[PDB]
Amino acid sequence: DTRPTIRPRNDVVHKQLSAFGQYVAEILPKYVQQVQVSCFNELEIFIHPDGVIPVLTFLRDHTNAQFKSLADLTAVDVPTRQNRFEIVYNLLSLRFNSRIRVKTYTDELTPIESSVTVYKAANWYEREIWDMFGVFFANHPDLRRILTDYGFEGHPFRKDFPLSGYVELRYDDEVKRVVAEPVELAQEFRKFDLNSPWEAFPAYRQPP
Amino acid sequence: KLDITTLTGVPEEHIKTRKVRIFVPARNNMQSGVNNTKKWKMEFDTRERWENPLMGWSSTADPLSNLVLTFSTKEDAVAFAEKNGWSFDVEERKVPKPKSKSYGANFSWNKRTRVSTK
Amino acid sequence: VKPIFSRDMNEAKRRVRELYRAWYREVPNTVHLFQLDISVKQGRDKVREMFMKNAHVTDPRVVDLLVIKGKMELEETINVWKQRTHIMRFFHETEAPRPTDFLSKFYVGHDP
Amino acid sequence: RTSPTGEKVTHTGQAYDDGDYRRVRFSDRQKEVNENFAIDLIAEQPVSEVGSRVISCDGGGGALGHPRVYINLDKETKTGTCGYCGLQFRQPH
Amino acid sequence: NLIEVFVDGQSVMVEPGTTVLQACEKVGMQIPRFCYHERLSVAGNCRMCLVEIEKAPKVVAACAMPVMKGWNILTNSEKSKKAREGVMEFLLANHPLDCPICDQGGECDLQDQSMMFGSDRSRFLEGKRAVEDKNIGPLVKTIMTRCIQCTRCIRFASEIAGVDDLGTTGRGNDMQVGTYIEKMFMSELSGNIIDICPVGALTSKPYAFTARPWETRKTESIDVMDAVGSNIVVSTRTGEVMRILPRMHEDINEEWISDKTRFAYDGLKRQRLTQPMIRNEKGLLTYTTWEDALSRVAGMLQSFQGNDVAAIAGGLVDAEALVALKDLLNRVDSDSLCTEEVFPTAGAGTDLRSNYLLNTTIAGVEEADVILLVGTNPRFEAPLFNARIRKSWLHNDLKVALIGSPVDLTYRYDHLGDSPKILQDIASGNHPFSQILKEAKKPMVVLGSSALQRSDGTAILAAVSNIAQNIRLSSGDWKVMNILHRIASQVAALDLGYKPGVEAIRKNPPKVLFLLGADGGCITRQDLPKDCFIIYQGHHGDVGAPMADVILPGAAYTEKSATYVNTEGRAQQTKVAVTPPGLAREDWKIIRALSEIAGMTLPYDTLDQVRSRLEEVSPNLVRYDDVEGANYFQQANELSKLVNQQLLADPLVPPQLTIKDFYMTDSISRASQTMAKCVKAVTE
Amino acid sequence: GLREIRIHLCQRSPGSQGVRDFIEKRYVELKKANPDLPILIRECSDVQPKLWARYAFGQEKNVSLNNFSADQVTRTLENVLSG
Amino acid sequence: PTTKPPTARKYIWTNHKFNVSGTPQQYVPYSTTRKKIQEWVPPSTPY
């Protein structure tokens, strides 16, 4: 619609992104599984996990796709899927002033090829993904805990990991050191059920 | 059968003693909306919640007290419980039966349905 | 499914033994480096205990990842990335022993 | 008011019992107790008499008060009480 | 026969007569509504369900308008959106700004529907209306200023409750809802009007101002106050039961729960047994450690065996505790496991579950055409069962006849009388109602367990069985014989094999008596040897606790995950909402620990193992939400025919005759201040 | 000695058909013969029918009744009653 | 405040107190609620 409340939408960028998505799909039919452009003009390419390195290399070196900047590499944990972890690569093409997202899937066991060869920035991002979610990255130069404690056990950002964790720290005089003890909260984190019983967005309705 | 229990990091006590309940949340009787009652959910058994002496705030040692995981289908929840080695009890979804409704029956000629007041 | 490192359980057991050798040989140095009060036997007993904890695994993929995690802990221990408390965390000391007898648990609390 | 133990009773009706070990926390320190009981204070406030059947109270000060609520005064024995303020209003007989 | 209608262009097949709202529900669209209720008659007054149909000039009321073949329901069209916005604006025009102080806040259909379909501002520059509140009882706090005149309460009271008290007074904007005179709305299902009310006009008086919906944690559970087996949702905040809400179960409680069930949680916080108590030298119960109490009880168990050690099952006990105690008594070669309720043991007795089950089931009531009630008061004995009977009578015109004292049942019935000889007359065919039963295609006979408590209970059972047999001979898989139990534990105990009645314990006075949650008072210290050792294991200290040498604190139904079987034989498991107070533990754990201390350790250490043992005793007690089909009618009938007791002339007067006799029944209810207030209100 | 007998027969399982026939005909006579003995009749599901027999001082022995004819079930019951 | 005095209210303190932390008049936290679950009282008369 119109008026200040509604956000203005640019259709030109939408058309450009759709065309380029088709371009990428045609060039890489072996790996590209699905191409989507969001209504807010964000092209997303879904690729089979085996194509992490080829697709990224194409999107980085190709003359008409000069995405030479790995903006952010992250993971989304959806426990309702067999391949719960979804590895998402956010790219930036300075030459064409555009961005693209490469989304792949992985299990808790299936390794994913490291993209350090494609982007050197991928090192620490993949370390974080392994540390927080537990997605092993094959051929990684140094895959180790980057954010958790040295002796920490478990992957915190997993949806099945408790928010407060399983262990807590304190200083004990008898052992003269900081010791790890089972977590005991003086005030339990009060879970608030806020989801309304009435549907909010008809456009995103999943038919039964 | 995938055995991720060794890789989860969950303490053994909270791998065996836990009793996961797979269920579809019931509709709050106060409201009439059914949007909440559309996705399967997984919750853990409730445990002791004592009182903190200083303030009276409820204290707990259960680390999984607040863990609620939503799942698209019952099979997904069952598989996830199996992966993590948690004893899971599944409650089949209860869908209200279709009910025949007639406004005319409120003004029936020879039936009990006839309403006394509108 | 693509194997993480080992295609078969026998290959995985080879990796497990390699890791066990490294941990077994590192324990004496670790006690010296962090000036731990545990004995070399105690550390090696803990290493064997930790390995035996994950002795029910049958999937080579899971065994591979367990070895990888075991390697990572060894790397931190060797590189002194861990601290003295971190090494001692394996030896749960302050934590009071939780009984297993039902009658004892019955007295202790509402523990299920 | 003060409990038999000697501990001043809060407006929330709370007073550590004699057998309560928690009473030791006030051994050398005072027990913070508010000395303006709200329930007593409103009881002091007089009951306004407004001829209109329905009156509206905002708590005073407009935007500095409470959401405006309309009170009905049909009940003769009872006096219309503000939901938020607690001020009582009556219809003159 | 299904006509093809379209919702938003999506084809959907619906049976003729389907309302537009129902078809939209079929495709997955929940049209906003305030007055329409699935279990209440269509009203069409709120006007919030207005929706546009393609090629139609005027928006239709989806809640009432039946679909026509070819209609394309434009649920999200501009017409529908604007209609919803306008109707919400009208609803909120006079609605008071009470959201911060309204208990319905956070769970108000008005709030959420305004947020999802209504506008975001108001054009009402005038003054709002104010309505004087009306007292309708000590349970439902009424603020009629917030009423939106949805007429849900009136329809519910008129049809489900059956009490024609609520109504609209006046016309226009001054139309007030409520009794014209100052009258208390008395019903066994009155509490549900709180739930049906979309706005916070009707609020739970005990739950008022206590907590908000978002913070409360919900735990689905089963009610134990009655044998209906109503599914409940225990809303607990910070480890404290805050309120009890109905859980949808079409087969048992639909969407309604009894007032006792809804407002008996307060009893769980009063007169509670927390620490083990043993009697001192002076003869006074004193707090002690679990070790000492269990050791004393174990020593007494070692001292005496056989009939010297007996157990009285309570009314709020669970299957797990029952099987644990049964095995413990078996360890001392004792079979005197008696229940507080007396079920005729002649003939088949408890051997055939059909002999003590409502074979027709609660759902079958809707299919029944003639229901005969014998010495029972279902309105108070089993409120939901009576509600189901009333629903069937309202829709299926089910004929109802009661052989008992004439008691209000919220529906009109044929009062055959109260003399038991009417049963003999019906069996012989002399009574015309026997002919009525002969004509009926699905006749149902219900015998109240209260009548079985009479000394001629065996004779009453024989007469009812003979009537059912005559019906069977005169006439699919329809069941006729049905027994309505009033105690939740009774069904499970009889399934396990507990002796139905304390008569056996009276016959052989036990030196050691174990009162497992037994507060009936059937057996006193006088009815026992002078050196009797009584062990009361309950959650509340009501009757057994004062007359007990050792008190073992037990867990309440909201404090344990236990199995309770309803009168229809459907095993159901409760869930843990809060942990037991003080040192109280799960009952089966207590019994198992006592067995270990005595040395006769029971073969289970976890809940799963105990339930496996329960399956070993009776497999039906582990198949939850399963009404197994077992007929075995002829065999039990013959075995009953074998013995011929004499019916007593004493009229079949049900123990409960008024709502005053309904409020306070169990130990929790007796310790419930709210139920006491209800009793006081109805008496005065 | 023997305190109670538990007969667990599945509703539709063909292996339980013999037990069903026993209950339909001979069970009435057996109950008349042994009034005091509680012949508990419960129902199984997706499991072989069994005959649990509780003896004195908490002793139980389950007898598989899978595909046992009515005569065979009666024989097993007699053996329990006749030692 | 001399030129524009603040609005006078009865509930306002008549003597401002400085931070009393570390002094015997310090504030000690405590619960303002009451006992939730009432316990059973054993009978005072020996059976």
Ligand code: SF4
């Ligand atoms: S009923 Fe709903 S909209 Fe009305 S005041 Fe209460 S919370 Fe607000």
Ligand code: SF4
């Ligand atoms: S009081 Fe509640 S249920 Fe009754 S008419 Fe008003 S809004 Fe509807």
Ligand code: FES
């Ligand atoms: S719900 Fe349709 S008019 Fe009320």
